[PDB]
Amino acid sequence: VNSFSGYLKLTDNVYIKNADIVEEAKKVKPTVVVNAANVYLKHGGGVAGALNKATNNAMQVESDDYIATNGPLKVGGSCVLSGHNLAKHCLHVVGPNVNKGEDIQLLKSAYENFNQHEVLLAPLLSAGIFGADPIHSLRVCVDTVRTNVYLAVFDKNLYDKLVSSFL
Numbered sequence: 001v002n003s004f005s006g007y008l009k010l011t012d013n014v015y016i017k018n019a020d021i022v023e024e025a026k027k028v029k030p031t032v033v034v035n036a037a038n039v040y041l042k043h044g045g046g047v048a049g050a051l052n053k054a055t056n057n058a059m060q061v062e063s064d065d066y067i068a069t070n071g072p073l074k075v076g077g078s079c080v081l082s083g084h085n086l087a088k089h090c091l092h093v094v095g096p097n098v099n100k101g102e103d104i105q106l107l108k109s110a111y112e113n114f115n116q117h118e119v120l121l122a123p124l125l126s127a128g129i130f131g132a133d134p135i136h137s138l139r140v141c142v143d144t145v146r147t148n149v150y151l152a153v154f155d156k157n158l159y160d161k162l163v164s165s166f167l
C-alpha cells in the first residue's frame with residue numbers, strides 16, 4: 001500500500017489521475033518525482049518550469065552545478081538529483097522534443113529510465129510543450145515501464161481523452 005489517492009488503474013503497474021504534478025508532489029512527497037527535463041536541465045516552462053518554481057529555483061541552482069560538472073544529458077537519458085520540497089529525489093528524464101525534430105523512437109529509451117525506480121510520480125514524457133501525441137506517450141509508457149508509475153495529467157480535457165481512448 002502507498003499514499004497515492006484517486007488514481008484510475010490502467011494496468012497492473014500504471015495508474016493515472018487528472019492532477020497538477022506540483023500539487024500532487026507537495027501532498028504525497030513521493031520517493032521519486034519525474035521531471036520532463038531537457039538535456040541542459042534548463043527548467044523554463046511546463047513540468048520543468050512549474051516544478052522548479054515550486055522549489056523557489058533551488059532545482060535550477062542544483063541543476064546548473066550538475067551540468068557544469070557533467071555536461072548535458074542525452075535525449076532519452078536521465079539523472080537523479082534532489083527532490084527538494086517536492087519528493088526525496090527528482091528523476092530528470094529527457095524525452096524527445098518533437099518541436100526540435102528529435103527521434104520519437106527515443107521515447108521508449110526515455111521511459112526505460114523509470115524501471116530503475118520501484119515507484120514514481122510522473123508526467124507523460126514528450127507531451128505538452130515537447131510536442132508528441134500524449135496518446136502515443138501513454139501507450140509507450142504502458143508497454144515500457146514495469147515499475148509502479150502514477151501519471152499526473154494536468155489538462156482535464158486530455159485526461160478524459162487518454163482514459164476514454166485507452167486500449
Ligand SMILES: Nc1nc2ccccc2c(=O)[nH]1
Binds near residue numbers: 020045047128153
Ligand atoms: N503548475 C503546472 N503544472 C503542469 C503539469 C504538467 C504540465 C505542465 C504544467 C504546467 O505548465 N504548470
